[PDB]
């Protein structure tokens, strides 16, 4: 079999993504019913930059599949410094059945996947956050049923990993995705083109706008994220002024559908991209969304392992 | 309805007796209780590393069938990247209990007010309640009933072990004496809570600078590292002091020991020392506490 | 009697063969042995981190049914805050074995003098005995019986791999040659221990600066990095002395036509070994890396049974 990897949301076809999301719902109901890693077999969970929350969901999820996660955090020498990335991948492939990697540039993930003989999963990268969006789609389906035809709007920095993955993963599910962002902070053109092509196959659409009011109107799902990642704190820009009109606050939420829900990948900077009232309010699904990282990532691993 | 264990008096006398009985049962049959089978997760978070505390909690959770997710001090501090309240809400979706080594008590209180799973103080600035459960297990297995015994702690009477031996000790019915120099005495709120609890159990609280009188007739003698050190040398737990205790007295020390400061080679390697059994019982007593908290939450 | 594994000759020739046979059995059936079911604990302690060593031990212990408790250098170094003997006595109450990566051999000896459970040297300044068990497992599966094979090691002849290939090699009956420049030769105590063990096994010890001669007719060619991190500030040019000992295609061509090449990794390609050799048909480095898992599990099973 071809080894399957999951480095970006569109690595799954629409039918494959539906299979993974249905498995996520099954695993939420019966969390120890799938044991492909019984043994235990190993899975590498490697952090070029620590993310303690990604650590909880993957370490526990792997264990609930019967496996043993070997967790490497940024205390270790960064992968590729002491030894070529290719050499490390060949050794890892002798010890583990899958490699979960949080890293920076997408080309590093691509390189690992080209040489490893086990599935490689992007746990979080500069360009994409596909496991978060699987958990988001699971959360939306829990609350609203069929995903096809829903309207989702994302607000804030339109070129970050969540904007890119909501575009790609959302249209793969048949969701009409809107990115509301200031000029200068718009989605990468190759990601946007990929999302537009995928939307053709599912009946979805891609919209990019600077009009936050228009993006909120009629939306079923509103999403935001922090405006600035750690790498961007020294980029020289004022990263508050451009985004203030895109804050997810009660006024924005009241423009959406009466049954709209609110998502946010965490961590949240309350008072910047989202207000306490919205985050702690009845439309917020952020805590269920965080829980579903555990279930959606287990489903993905089960699915990749059985295909590889 | 969620029970937490942040200080020794969080357990009533009757509840503490239940936990210590369970600790004895688990020492005999260490994999007979599997409330975390699955595995279910337990968070084990250190704001400052304590390797001894990691071993005992991590293995204990595994022997309950669970998986400990261990976060060492290297990682960004809990509460730096998001509110402790938001962290507690997310942790409560991934794990069945939160074991936390932090500094100030108000951080523990903040986590426990929000988390919907039990929170356990692994070790803090003000209290070390899990160590005192292990100490009480050790005393019981060597002397039987705890009620009425005399325990004396020597040295820094302001630290977490002095506070927890006062509260946990009087909760078990033990007459507790802290022997300490004048600048290093128990916190007055802790001392008062121990005096009140002592009225329920028949116990008592004494604080003195007279190490000789603290040692005379003691059944259990305890010390701890002293951290500038001249004030503690008269409270050194040495052979002279131990010679004053009741026959078959036992010496405890939470470790690590600095041999030649707070305790001598002769006392620590001698026949009264129960320091190695004490260390082993961190594993059993902490497992018992988790089983008990999980059942009531 | 508690059995420890601090240096390669801690096993007799017969005992080493038992461990290597077990390593082959565990490679075939990796979860058939569960001496640590429970789980029981095993301490895995790193005075200096080695992520690649952690993976093999942590997974191997789990596949024996146990739980590895890992301590790395972010914690207070063992010995600083209490005696090593006190720490050994407490660890012995929590775990069934102690795996330790540390520096001088006296530290390992101190731990093992008091521990009531097996102590295993995961990697130290003087020896790397678990790696050589994995090397011997690899040689055996590529060449068959070990007795009488000719193995040559190239590079820094005073490092942990040279010492362990000497001791573990002659324990298996292998004729071991160390090819190294003057000033970088095996420790005399280690060389003498290997010479004495070789008399029991029919093996031999050779130390030479003639890299050509060491490669000629060799069945196994081995190298390692020329510098450990603790040596970077030692004041020596640690490149020019070792260039003649590079494991390159010209050197490999001198060996037996069926020769294999070993390297404990990570490799610095272009220094001690070239891409052509690393990636060519004689290289066994990836199987070697895998066999760390199996050989270490076999060692643990064997020590636990005897302790
Ligand atoms: C994933 C990482 S990161 C590092 N310093 N080493 C490794 C590694 C792990 C297993 C095998 C080889 C290298
Ligand atoms: C292995 C290490 S490292 C450190 N600072 N303490 C310990 C330790 C662990 C368990 C018991 C006693 C000490």
């Amino acid at each position: 079999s071809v080894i399957r990897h999951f480095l970006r949301d569109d690595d799954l076809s629409p039918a494959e993504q539906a299979e993974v999301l249905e498995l996520a719902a099954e695993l939420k109901k019966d969390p120890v019913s799938r044991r492909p890693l019984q043994g235990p077999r190993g899975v590498a969970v490697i952090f070029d930059k620590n993310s303690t929350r990604t650590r909880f969901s993957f370490e526990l999820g792997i264990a609930q599949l019967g496996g043993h996660a070997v967790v490497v955090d940024s205390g270790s020498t960064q992968l590729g410094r002491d030894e070529t990335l290719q050499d490390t991948a060949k050794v890892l492939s002798r010890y583990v059945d899958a490699i979960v990697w949080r890293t920076f540039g997408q080309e590093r993930l691509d390189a690992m996947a080209s040489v490893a003989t086990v599935p490689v999963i992007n746990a979080l990268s500069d360009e994409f956050h596909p496991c978060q969006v699987l958990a988001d789609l699971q959360t939306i389906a829990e609350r609203k049923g069929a995903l096809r035809g829903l309207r989702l709007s994302y607000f804030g920095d339109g070129a970050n990993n969540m904007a890119h993955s909501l575009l790609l993963g959302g249209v793969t599910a048949g969701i009409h995705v809107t990115v509301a962002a200031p000029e200068g902070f718009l989605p990468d053109p190759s990601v946007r083109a990929a999302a537009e092509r995928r939307a053709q196959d599912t009946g979805a659409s891609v919209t990019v706008t600077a009009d936050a009011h228009a993006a909120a109107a009629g939306a079923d799902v509103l999403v935001t994220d922090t405006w600035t990642s750690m790498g961007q704190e020294n980029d020289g820009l004022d990263r508050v002024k451009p985004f203030r009109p895109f804050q997810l606050n009660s006024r924005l939420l009241a423009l959406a559908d009466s049954d709209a829900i609110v998502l946010h990948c965490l961590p949240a900077h309350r008072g910047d991209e989202i207000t306490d009232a919205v985050m702690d309010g009845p439309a917020s699904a952020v805590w269920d969304e965080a829980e579903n990282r555990l279930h959606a990532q287990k489903a993905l691993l089960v699915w990749l392992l059985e295909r590889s």
Side-chain angles (χ1 to χ4, degrees), chain A residues 42-80 82-150 152-182 184-229 231-250 252-298:
Chain A
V43 175
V45 186
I46 305 156
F47 293 95
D48 287 8
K49 162 150 199 293
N50 301 353
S51 166
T52 298
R53 188 172 306 98
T54 305
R55 152 130 194 250
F56 274 75
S57 61
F58 271 108
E59 185 168 336
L60 283 169
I62 288 160
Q64 287 166 8
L65 298 181
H68 179 81
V70 182
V71 179
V72 176
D73 74 22
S74 64
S76 304
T77 294
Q78 158 177 117
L79 190 155
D82 282 348
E83 162 172 67
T84 63
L85 182 155
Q86 291 72 21
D87 285 354
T88 298
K90 296 189 178 171
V91 176
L92 280 171
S93 300
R94 299 304 191 95
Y95 292 148
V96 298
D97 276 4
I99 299 167
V100 176
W101 196 14
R102 181 274 188 264
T103 193
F104 307 100
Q106 193 71 11
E107 77 287 330
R108 291 171 59 79
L109 282 159
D110 288 344
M112 180 64 95
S114 73
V115 289
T117 55
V118 298
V120 178
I121 297 170
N122 180 1
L124 170 71
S125 75
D126 289 337
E127 206 175 349
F128 307 103
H129 198 1
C131 293
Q132 180 74 46
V133 169
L134 290 181
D136 287 0
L137 297 167
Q138 176 172 15
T139 308
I140 298 155
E142 280 171 354
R143 310 267 190 134
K144 291 195 171 277
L147 296 179
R148 179 185 182 71
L150 293 177
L152 180 155
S153 298
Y154 167 88
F155 302 78
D157 176 10
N160 75 356
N161 46 23
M162 283 306 306
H164 288 156
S165 284
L166 286 163
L167 284 166
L168 290 179
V171 301
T172 299
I175 300 177
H176 301 274
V177 177
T178 298
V179 164
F185 301 90
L186 301 188
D188 170 81
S190 76
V191 176
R192 181 179 185 168
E196 280 157 357
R197 170 60 179 91
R198 175 67 56 97
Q200 273 188 340
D201 292 350
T202 67
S205 60
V206 169
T207 304
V208 177
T209 184
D211 184 347
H213 180 294
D220 295 304
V221 183
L222 304 183
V223 190
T224 190
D225 190 17
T226 55
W227 293 333
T228 298
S229 72
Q232 289 171 321
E233 295 180 7
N234 198 36
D235 70 1
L237 290 173
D238 176 340
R239 297 191 65 97
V240 172
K241 188 158 282 171
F243 300 116
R244 293 191 83 204
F246 300 85
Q247 177 183 73
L248 177 45
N249 54 34
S250 298
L252 197 75
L253 178 61
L255 291 172
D257 178 271
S258 84
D259 281 330
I261 62 165
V262 169
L263 299 179
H264 191 313
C265 61
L266 310 179
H269 301 341
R270 287 150 180 274
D272 291 347
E273 70 278 359
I274 193 167
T275 64
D276 292 328
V278 169
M279 174 112 167
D280 296 327
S284 175
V286 304
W287 307 125
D288 288 344
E289 171 190 15
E291 179 186 330
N292 291 335
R293 295 281 305 275
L294 170 68
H295 312 302
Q297 286 158 186
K298 290 161 70 173

Side-chain angles (χ1 to χ4, degrees), chain A residues 33-47:
Chain A
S33 66
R34 302 297 293 252
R35 306 286 286 204
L37 294 166
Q38 198 66 21
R41 312 281 290 181
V43 175
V45 186
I46 305 156
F47 293 95

Side-chain angles (χ1 to χ4, degrees), chain A residues 293-306:
Chain A
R293 295 281 305 275
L294 170 68
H295 312 302
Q297 286 158 186
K298 290 161 70 173
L300 176 74
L301 263 156
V302 171
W303 191 91
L304 292 170
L305 290 166
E306 58 182 353

